[PDB]
Amino acid sequence: SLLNPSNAPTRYAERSVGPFSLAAIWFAMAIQVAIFIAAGQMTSSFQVWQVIVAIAAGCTIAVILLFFTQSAAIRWGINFTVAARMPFGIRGSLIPITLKALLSLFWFGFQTWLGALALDEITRLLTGFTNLPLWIVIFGAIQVVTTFYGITFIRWMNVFASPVLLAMGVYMVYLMLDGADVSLGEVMSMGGENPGMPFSTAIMIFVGGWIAVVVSIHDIVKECKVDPNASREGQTKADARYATAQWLGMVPASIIFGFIGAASMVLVGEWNPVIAITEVVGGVSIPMAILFQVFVLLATWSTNPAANLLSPAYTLCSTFPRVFTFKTGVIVSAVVGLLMMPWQFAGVLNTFLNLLASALGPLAGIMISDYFLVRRRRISLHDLYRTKGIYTYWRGVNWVALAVYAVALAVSFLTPDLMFVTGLIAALLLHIPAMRWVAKTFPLFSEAESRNEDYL
Ligand SMILES: O=C1NC(=O)/C(=C/c2cccc(Br)c2)N1
Numbered sequence: 001s002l003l004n005p006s007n008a009p010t011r012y013a014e015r016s017v018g019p020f021s022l023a024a025i026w027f028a029m030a031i032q033v034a035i036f037i038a039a040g041q042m043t044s045s046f047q048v049w050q051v052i053v054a055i056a057a058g059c060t061i062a063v064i065l066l067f068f069t070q071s072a073a074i075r076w077g078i079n080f081t082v083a084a085r086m087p088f089g090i091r092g093s094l095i096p097i098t099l100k101a102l103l104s105l106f107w108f109g110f111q112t113w114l115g116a117l118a119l120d121e122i123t124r125l126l127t128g129f130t131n132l133p134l135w136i137v138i139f140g141a142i143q144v145v146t147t148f149y150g151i152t153f154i155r156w157m158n159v160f161a162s163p164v165l166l167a168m169g170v171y172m173v174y175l176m177l178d179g180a181d182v183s184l185g186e187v188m189s190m191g192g193e194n195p196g197m198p199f200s201t202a203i204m205i206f207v208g209g210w211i212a213v214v215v216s217i218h219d220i221v222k223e224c225k226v227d228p229n230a231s232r233e234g235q236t237k238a239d240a241r242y243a244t245a246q247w248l249g250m251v252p253a254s255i256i257f258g259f260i261g262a263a264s265m266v267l268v269g270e271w272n273p274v275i276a277i278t279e280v281v282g283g284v285s286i287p288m289a290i291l292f293q294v295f296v297l298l299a300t301w302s303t304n305p306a307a308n309l310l311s312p313a314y315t316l317c318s319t320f321p322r323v324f325t326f327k328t329g330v331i332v333s334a335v336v337g338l339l340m341m342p343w344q345f346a347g348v349l350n351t352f353l354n355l356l357a358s359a360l361g362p363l364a365g366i367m368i369s370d371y372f373l374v375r376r377r378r379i380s381l382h383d384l385y386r387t388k389g390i391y392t393y394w395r396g397v398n399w400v401a402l403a404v405y406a407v408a409l410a411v412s413f414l415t416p417d418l419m420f421v422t423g424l425i426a427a428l429l430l431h432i433p434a435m436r437w438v439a440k441t442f443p444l445f446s447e448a449e450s451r452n453e454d455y456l
């Protein structure tokens with residue numbers, strides 16, 4: 001048995017996130033430093049309004065993906081790590097999942113760093129003392145302790161951060177535009193003086209940004225509110241109501257702040273708003289500086305935990321269920337996380353983001369296909385928590401699914417500027433014949449699937 005209280009399906013009465021609340025999580029989750037860099041650097045290849053469009057477009061494809069990748073977790077309260085067990089093996093899933101937990105972990109050390117930079121700036125603008133690594137750990141530590149309260153803290157922190165972040169940001173735009181003596185419409189076309197990058201690969205850079213979160217949303221959305229006695233058509237509006245809520249959370253948030261990153265770049269030559277606003281205004285008081293840094297901290301806190309730390313936690317406590325618990329998995333993930341020292345990664349994000357999509361594109365495709373197409377949403381919780389059952393395949397690993405991943409990865413390379421969308425679609429489509437083959441050796445359903453509601 002692989003079950004323990006932390007890695008267990010989430011009972012109907014334990015669910016706490018409705019559609020408005022999930023939006024309140026996503027709005028604050030989209031407000032984060034890294035989108036300044038991406039959308040800023042985008043101004044090299046396109047002008048600001050197009051970048052906003054590449055953001056809105058990229059935000060929207062992510063949501064279309066969320067609608068499908070979230071549907072099993074909402075209905076059945078299960079993990080990401082647990083859910084991968086279906087098409088890949090019970091252990092074979094560890095292969096893509098280790099790929100993915102690493103990614104998740106990479107973002108965690110990056111943002112803890114940005115957070116640390118902020119806190120270190122606040123202090124040295126007071127105490128002149130400027131030690132960063134201590135502030136790194138301390139922040140890593142602070143996130144861990146606030147992550148202990150799982151989605152409960154997250155949900156309360158993001159609803160209050162959201163408007164504050166929203167206001168600090170609208171203010172930010174005012175300060176720039178004003179202090180530069182420029183209208184909104186004027187800045188909107190000042191960019192794009194070095195074309196070459198396809199607009200498709202632009203959209204693909206923002207899609208490739210959230211793909212880790214989108215693919216493994218489970219760990220967030222297994223907490224959303226569901227009515228067990230709906231129907232096919234009431235379940236679909238429910239999925240859609242949640243999917244709609246994520247759109248209204250991440251789009252307007254990442255459009256306003258994407259715009260700020262782009263604006264910074266285009267007005268002053270730097271993606272970092274500290275610099276762009278400081279110059280344009282010609283210095284700022286120590287208070288109003290500290291503010292900005294409180295923002296970065298508030299903006300890092302609203303994104304890092306929920307998006308980067310939750311999912312390796314659940315990966316640990318659910319693979320080694322007697323060794324790790326959620327809280328203990330959080331401690332081990334944040335330590336490993338910081339010991340990856342991701343702040344030394346050579347390059348820029350865009351190409352990395354272009355990497356992230358085409359690396360997990362087939363993974364999202366194989367999971368959507370297994371659950372929706374092959375099995376028709378008809379799953380067995382019982383077998384997901386047991387070493388030997390209908391998800392054990394060949395001695396714990398489903399090599400055919402690992403085969404479909406490779407093949408689909410290959411085909412993905414045949415369309416470099418659309419890598420992600422071909423690899424997903426390829427994996428999606430190939431899983432079907434591959435699974436209709438495996439079904440001749442192994443069963444796709446189980447009698448024990450009637451105990452599903454016992455868990456809930
Ligand atoms: O999965 C993710 N964890 C992160 O921290 C993260 C950052 C990010 C997301 C979208 C666009 C951009 Br630009 C950056 N993604």
Ligand code: NA
Nearest residue numbers: 028299302303
């Ligand atoms: Na945030």
